[PDB]
Amino acid sequence: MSLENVAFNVVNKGHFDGQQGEVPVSIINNTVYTKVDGVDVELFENKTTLPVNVAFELWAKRNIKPVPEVKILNNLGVDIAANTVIWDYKRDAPAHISTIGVCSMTDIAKKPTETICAPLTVFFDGRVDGQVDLFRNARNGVLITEGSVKGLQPSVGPKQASLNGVTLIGEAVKTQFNYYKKVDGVVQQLPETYFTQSRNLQEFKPRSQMEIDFLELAMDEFIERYKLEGYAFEHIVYGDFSHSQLGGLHLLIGLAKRFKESPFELEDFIPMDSTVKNYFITDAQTGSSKCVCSVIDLLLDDFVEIIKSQDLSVVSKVVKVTIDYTEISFMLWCKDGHVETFYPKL
Amino acid sequence: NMSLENVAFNVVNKGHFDGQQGEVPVSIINNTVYTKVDGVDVELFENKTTLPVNVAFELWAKRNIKPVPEVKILNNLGVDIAANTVIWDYKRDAPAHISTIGVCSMTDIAKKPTETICAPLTVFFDGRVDGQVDLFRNARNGVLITEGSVKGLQPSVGPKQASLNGVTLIGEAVKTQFNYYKKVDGVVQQLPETYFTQSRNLQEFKPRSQMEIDFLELAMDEFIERYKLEGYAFEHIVYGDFSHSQLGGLHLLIGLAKRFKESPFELEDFIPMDSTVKNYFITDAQTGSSKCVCSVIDLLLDDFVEIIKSQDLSVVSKVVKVTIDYTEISFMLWCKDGHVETFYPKL
Amino acid sequence: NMSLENVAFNVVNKGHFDGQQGEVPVSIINNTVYTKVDGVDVELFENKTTLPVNVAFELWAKRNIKPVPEVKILNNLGVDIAANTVIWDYKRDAPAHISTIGVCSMTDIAKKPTETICAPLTVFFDGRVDGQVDLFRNARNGVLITEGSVKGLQPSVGPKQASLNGVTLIGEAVKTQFNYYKKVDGVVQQLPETYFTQSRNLQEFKPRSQMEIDFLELAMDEFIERYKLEGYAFEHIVYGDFSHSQLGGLHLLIGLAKRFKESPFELEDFIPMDSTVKNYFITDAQTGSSKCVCSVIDLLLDDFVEIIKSQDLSVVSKVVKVTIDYTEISFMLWCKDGHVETFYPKL
Amino acid sequence: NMSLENVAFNVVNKGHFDGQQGEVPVSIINNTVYTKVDGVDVELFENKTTLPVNVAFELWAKRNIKPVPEVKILNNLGVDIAANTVIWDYKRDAPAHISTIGVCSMTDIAKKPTETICAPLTVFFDGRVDGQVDLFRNARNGVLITEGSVKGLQPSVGPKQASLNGVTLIGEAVKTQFNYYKKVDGVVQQLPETYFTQSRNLQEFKPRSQMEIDFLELAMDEFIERYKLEGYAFEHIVYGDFSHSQLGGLHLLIGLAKRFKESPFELEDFIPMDSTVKNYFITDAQTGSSKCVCSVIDLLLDDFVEIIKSQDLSVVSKVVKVTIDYTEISFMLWCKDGHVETFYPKL
Amino acid sequence: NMSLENVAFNVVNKGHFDGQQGEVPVSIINNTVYTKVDGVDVELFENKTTLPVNVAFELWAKRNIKPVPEVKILNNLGVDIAANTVIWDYKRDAPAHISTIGVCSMTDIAKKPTETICAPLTVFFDGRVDGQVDLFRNARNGVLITEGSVKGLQPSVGPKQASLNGVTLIGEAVKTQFNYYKKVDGVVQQLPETYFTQSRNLQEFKPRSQMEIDFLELAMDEFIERYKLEGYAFEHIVYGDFSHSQLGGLHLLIGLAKRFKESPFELEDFIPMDSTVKNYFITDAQTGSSKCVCSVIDLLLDDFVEIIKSQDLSVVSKVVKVTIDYTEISFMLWCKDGHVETFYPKL
Ligand SMILES: O=c1ccn([C@@H]2O[C@@H](COP(=O)(O)O)[C@@H](OP(=O)(O)O)[C@@H]2O)c(=O)[nH]1
Ligand SMILES: O=c1ccn([C@@H]2O[C@@H](COP(=O)(O)O)[C@@H](OP(=O)(O)O)[C@@H]2O)c(=O)[nH]1
Ligand SMILES: O=c1ccn([C@@H]2O[C@@H](COP(=O)(O)O)[C@@H](OP(=O)(O)O)[C@@H]2O)c(=O)[nH]1
C-alpha cells in the first residue's frame, strides 16, 4: 500500500480500485506526476492544506458512489466518515480532517468500533455491508440507506445527491436516502425539514409549475396568480436594481431569471457547500451592487409556504426554519402589515 | 488595531475590509490564505501578486469597491499612487500601484497625502470621499475625479464606463462618468480633448451606434459602399485579410467581434495588463491565418472613421499622433497611389 | 548570446522568441516569470512543467509557431526529439520531448542533429526549414514532413489537420496536410496505410461526412435502419446505454457530442495528454449512469462502420488491431449469435 | 485580542510572547516570518515544522521558557498534550504535541484543561503555575510536576536535569529536579523506580562519578581489572570493537566520549528526535569501521555496571526489561560459555 | 515492488535501504520528507538536489555504504554512471551521476549495464559485488575497482583514501585502496602513472611525511634552507604574501593549514563540488589581504617539490601539465633570472 500503487490505480482505473502494480511518480511543488511515454504527465494538483502525497491518496480513495452533499453532512454534525472518503468538490479537499481505515497518515482508527470514534459523529453507509449494525452500536453517528431498516423510523432525505462532484437526481441510480441519527447512544427523531435544491445559474431547471410560471409570467402577473401581494416578492425574489445598493434578490430562482436576461458577477468569498450562501454581487447592466447578498435555493413552492405563514405585524423579528436538517435564521422586517424584506442568514 | 486575523474577519463577514472589529483563525500555506469553518480549511485568497501573501491579502481586502476609473486611464494620466485607498488591478490580479497612502503599514510610504514624499508623485484623489477634494488643490502633482462640478476648475469629461469590483460597466443605478482634473508641479493643466476606448470584449460585444449596427449586419462591400470608405483599406484594417499565412490588419475590436460570430479564433494576451492598445498573438481557426503581434484598439467605429478620414493620403509612410484615453497614441499610415495601405496603432 | 532577459525581451515585443536583440527586467517567483512594465510587475509565463522555471520559459518562447503535427501523431511515429525547434505540447503545457537539439544550452544534447548521441534517436525533421530535408537523408533514424514531393521517396499523406499554437485546424491560408517519411537505421521505411482521428471536441463538434450529418439529426432507430447497422450494437457502442448504474458503450466521440447536445455530463481526463485513444471518467448528469474508464476515439463515423463491418462475428472474444494515426490501436470485440455485443478501443 | 502582528511585536520586544499589547508590520514569504527594521526585512522565524508558517510561529513564540522536562520523559510518561503552554521540542524544532489547550485558536482542542475532549488524553500540568495543581487532581489522565511536596501524594523523584530554552542543564540558580505524579483513568498510579539517562553529548561530555573519571583516564584493561568486569564484554559493549568492517558494541555514550577524544567519527541521526535510546549510523574515521544501526544510551556508567551485573549468564540469548526514564527498555543479552557476549538496548 | 513508504521503512529501521519489507506513514512538504513517530512528524530527509523530492529521497536511501572512490577520482576517470548502485556526492549532497542502472524506476535508463544505451557510456563497476568483474569484461566502456588481482589485467594502484558515508579516510578495518582498471570501446587501457591529492581539510590537517612535519614546526627561512628550495618561490607559493592588498600565492593546502593554525581567514567555496583543484575566495582576517580566485591543491609536499624542481626555469611563462588523480592538471609557471616567480594550478 504505497504512493506508487495509488498512482497505478489512478492511471489504469481512474481512482483507487485495490489493483496492485506500481508506476514511477515525481512530486514537485504540490503536483503528482508520472512518466508516460518518456514525458511527465500531471495526475493531481494539491489544493488542500494536507501534504501533497496524503491529499493525493485521499482523492484517489474518494467515494465514487452517490453520496450526500457536504452541507447535509455538516448540518447533521458529521465529524468523520467510516471506511471511505467524502471528497468536498466545492473546496477540492477532503470533507473531514481525519479518516477511519483509509490512509495510514490520516487514520485516527482502523474500524469505527474504536474508542476515539465513540464521541465523534461517524457517517455510516448502508450500501456497505455490516455498516448498518455498526450504526446502532455507535454512540454518535449518522446513517443513510436505500431501503428501510428494521427497528428504525426513516427520515426521507433530499432527491439529489453528489456523484463524483455532479449533483443530480438519480434515474439509473438511487440518490434519495433514508437518514438516521444517534446522539450519546440515543436515537434522534429527525425533524421534518425543507430541502434546498442545489442548483446553479447556468443550468437552472424549474421543478414545479409555480417555478415555471415564475420564469414565464411577468412580475405583476405572477404575484397576481399566487396572490403574493404585500409579501414583497418584488424585493425579496425579483430584486431591486434601481439604487446603487442592490435590494433583495435572496432566492436562487430569482437570480437565475435575472441572469437569463442580463449578466451579473457573483463573488463566492467563502467557497464551501452550505445551505445558505453569501455572495458579493455586482450587476453588470445597472451597476447595482451589494457586499453581502445571502441566497438560498428553496423550491419556490416551499418559500411561498414559509413566508405566507408569518406574522406581518411585528416590525422586526427573527424566524427559524428547518432546512437541510438544520435551523436557518431569517430576518423578517415589516411595516404597516406588509413585508419589508425577508432573507436568510449564514 | 490592524492585523491579519482582523482583515480575514472582515473578508468572511462583510465580503471585504469594512473596519469591523473581530478575529478569525488563519493559516498561511503556499501563496494562499485559509480559515476554518466547521473544522475544515476554506480558501479565502490566492496570492497571484509579487508581494508577500499576507500583504497582498490585506491590500485586496481593502480594494476600492465603488466604481473607479480603469487602470489604463490612470496610467495614461500619470498616476503613481492613490490616496487612502487601493485600486485593485483586476487585469493583473494585483494592486495597480507599487505603494499606498494611509492603507497598509507594509506598503505605506505615508499615512496622509500631504506628506513630503508624495509631492513629486501624481496622487489620485476621489472627490466622492470627504476632504479628498480639498487635498487635491494643495497637492503638487495629482489627478482628481468627481461627480459634480468643481468651483473655478474647468472639467474634462471622461469615459462613460468605470470599473466596479472588476466589472467594467456604464452605470445606471450608480454614476460611472467622471470629471477629470490634473495638476502638475502645483499648477492646473488643461487636459486635451480625447477619444475614449469602449472597453468591450468579444464574448458580449454590443454595438453602441448605428454605424456599428450596420457593420455587424451588412456585408463588407455593402458597408464600405454605404459609408463611402473606398480608399481607406477597411477590408484590411478592420475586416482583416485571412487569405495569407500572415494575417493582415484586424486592428479594430469590432472587426474581431464580427469575425468571432462567424468563426472562433485564439487571442494570446502575452502582456496581460490594461492598456489603450493591446497586442495579441492571434490564430484564426478557420483559415490558419496567424500573426505574432496584432495590435487591437476598441474605438467606436465612428471615431475610427473620423480619425482615418482626416488624414493625408499623399505621404507613402507617416506616423500620426491621436489623443485617446488622455495619451498620445502613435499610428502608422502606409499609403500608396493616393489610397491608404494600412493604419495600425502601436503599443 | 543566449540570455534570460533577452528571451523575455522577445516575448514582450515579438510574442515569442524571434532572435531580436535587447533585454528587459525580469523577476522569478514560485514557478512564474514576471517583467516590470511601467513600474509594476506583469506575469509573462507560469511554469507547469517538471523543468526549472527559467528553462521551461525559454523552451516555451522558442516553440514552433508554424502548423506542426499533433503530439499524438509524433508519438505514434516514435519521435524522440525535434531538430532545431521545440514542439510545444499544449495538452500538457510542456515540451513534447525530454531533450533538444540546437535550441537551449540547458536542455541541448547536441547542437546539430548529425552528432553521435542522436543516431539511435528518431529526430523530427521539418522539410519547410531549409536544409532539414538533406539532414533527414544523413540521419539514421528520423521522421520528415514536407508539403511537397521529395525525389525518390514514396510519400505517405498525413492527416488534414495540424496544430498551430495549440489550435488544431485544417489550413486554408496555410497547409496543414503533410507528406510523411520515416527512416530506421538508414533505410527509408514504407509507412502503413492508416486511418486518422478527427481531433474534434464536444463543444465545437461539426460533422464531416453525410453519414455523420444523418447521425445528429435523425433518430436512433432511423439511422441504424438507413445504413444497415442492425446487429452491430450501434445502440450500445455509439449511442450509449444510460439505463444501468454502469454506463454502457459510448466509445465514439460523435456519440458523446450528440448526448452533450441535449444533456450535460462530466468528463474527467485523469491522464491529460494527447493520444489517439482517450480514457475518461464519465458521469451523466441526467441519469447518474457513470463509468470509471470509458475509452473514446474520434474516428470519422464512415471509417468506424467499415472497420466494424469487416470483422468476423464468429468468435466470442477477439482482439482486433487497426492502424489509426500510424499505430496499432487494439480493439476488443465481443460477439454473440452473429451480432456484436460491444466493440471498444484500448489505451 | 490575538493576532500575527501582535505575536511578532512580543517577539521583537520581549524575545518571546509576553502578552504585551502592540503591533509590528509582518510579511510572510516561503516558510519564514519577516519584519521591517529601518526599511529592510529581518528574519524573525523559519518554519521547520509541518504546520503552517504563521501557526508554528505563534506556537514557538508561546513556548515555555522555564525549565521543563525533556520531551523524552513526557513521551515515556504518556503525555499527549500540555495544559495552557507549549513545550517546544528543540530536537525536532517543532511543537512536542499535536494539539494545545488555551494557547492558540488554530491548534486548540479546548480552552481549559477541564473540557470533555481532554478526559481521555494524558495532560501535562506544571505545578509551578497557580491552579495547575488543582487542575491535576480533578483530571482523568494527567502528569504533574512540582517543586515541593504535594499533600497526600507520594512523589517520584525525577531526573536532575531539565530543558531550559533548548539547553539541557542541571539547574543551580533555578530548580530543575521535579516530583512526578501520574494519574490514569482518574486513579493515581505508582510510578516505578527507574534509572535516568544523563542527557549528555560528546562535544562537552563530563564525568559525573569516580568510576566515569577512571573510565576516561584509565586504559581498557586497567579499568576492567579495577572494577572486576571480566566476563561482561566491556571491551565490546562499552569500549567498542573497531577491528572489523562492522563496528561491534559501542552502546554507551561514555564509550563514544572516550573514543571521541582519541579520534573523530560521524554520527548520523537518521531519526532526529528525543528518545531514551538513540540509533545512529556510525562511521569511525581512523579505522573505517562502521555500522548501520548502532543503538546508544547515555547511562551513568555505575548504573550500567549495576544493570549488567544483576543479569543471569546461563541463558544463551535473553531479552531483559529495565525501567529507564519511566519506560520499559528492552535489552538483548547474548551469552556464551557463561560470559556475556553482548548487551545492547533496543529502540 | 518499489514503494515510497517502503523506502522510508528501511531508512527508519536500517538507517538506509536494505531491501527489508514494510511501510511507514510519510508526509511530503516543500522539499522535505517526514514520517509520523508516536503521533508527531519527524524529518527524515531534506532535498538539496534538482530532482523531485521523492526521487532524490530514494536515491539517498540506496546510496553505497561501502568505501567508494571520491567523486573527484570518478570524474577525472570519465565515469558517467554507476552499475546497480548510487554514488552519493556528499560535497554536493546529491547523486554523483544523472542517471542510474537497476536502482530506481524513475531515474533508470536500464536495468542491467549490458543494454544498448550504456555502450557509449563509462559505467563504474565495483569488483567487490559478485558478478561486476565479468560485467566489466562485457562492457565497451567502464571503470572497475577491486581490492585484489584480476587475471590478465595490469593493475593501477589507486589513492590510499576512499569515501565511506561522506567520510574520506584511509581504511584499517576495511580497505580503501583499490586497483583501478579502465576500458574504452572494448580495449583495456593502461592507466597513467599519477600523483594523488591527500583530500585533507584545514581543521583536521595532519602531516603525512617527515618533510611536511618540518614545514609546520620549523620557521619559514629554516625550512627553505634545509630542503634547498632557494629560488623556487616557496616564500610566495606555499607560505603566502599578505603584505599587499591582493593576496599572493598560497596554492598548497598545507600552507593554508599553517596559516589557519595561528590566524583565522575566510574561504568562500563559490563552486561547491569535489575536484582535484579548488577555487576559493580567500580573505585574511588579520591583514585584510584577499584574492577573488585562489587555486588550492592538497598534494603531499614531497610530491610538490619534485614536480617544481623538475621543470625548467628558462622560459618566462610555461604551462606545465602534471598527472594528478588520473587527469591532466595544468600548472602556470612564471620564471625570471633562473628562479620561480609563481607556480599555481588551474581549474
Ligand atoms: O429599517 C430597515 C433597515 C434595514 N432593512 C433591511 O435590511 C437590509 C439588509 O441588511 P443591511 O444591508 O445590513 O442593513 C435590507 O435587506 P435586503 O435589501 O438585503 O433585502 C433591508 O433594507 C429594512 O428592511 N428596514
Ligand atoms: O509595403 C508595405 C510594407 C508593410 N506594410 C504594413 O506594415 C506591416 C506591419 O508589420 P510588419 O510586416 O512586421 O512590419 C503590415 O501591417 P498590418 O496592417 O498587416 O498589420 C503592413 O503590411 C505596408 O502597408 N506596406
Ligand atoms: O463477457 C463480457 C465481458 C465484458 N463485456 C464488455 O466489456 C465491458 C467493459 O469492461 P468491464 O466493464 O470491465 O467488464 C463492457 O463494455 P462497455 O460497456 O465498456 O462498452 C461489456 O460488458 C462483454 O460484452 N461481455
Ligand SMILES: O=c1ccn([C@@H]2O[C@@H](COP(=O)(O)O)[C@@H](OP(=O)(O)O)[C@@H]2O)c(=O)[nH]1
Ligand atoms: O552469535 C551471535 C550473533 C549476534 N550477536 C549479537 O547480535 C548482533 C546484533 O546486530 P545484528 O548482527 O544485526 O543482529 C551484534 O550486536 P552488537 O553488540 O555487535 O552491536 C552481536 O554480534 C551475538 O552476540 N552473538
Ligand SMILES: O=c1ccn([C@@H]2O[C@@H](COP(=O)(O)O)[C@@H](OP(=O)(O)O)[C@@H]2O)c(=O)[nH]1
Ligand atoms: O607577468 C605576470 C603576470 C602574472 N603573474 C602571476 O599571476 C598572478 C595570478 O593571476 P592574476 O592576479 O590575474 O594576474 C599572480 O600569481 P598568484 O599571486 O595568484 O600566485 C602572479 O602575479 C606573474 O607572476 N607575472
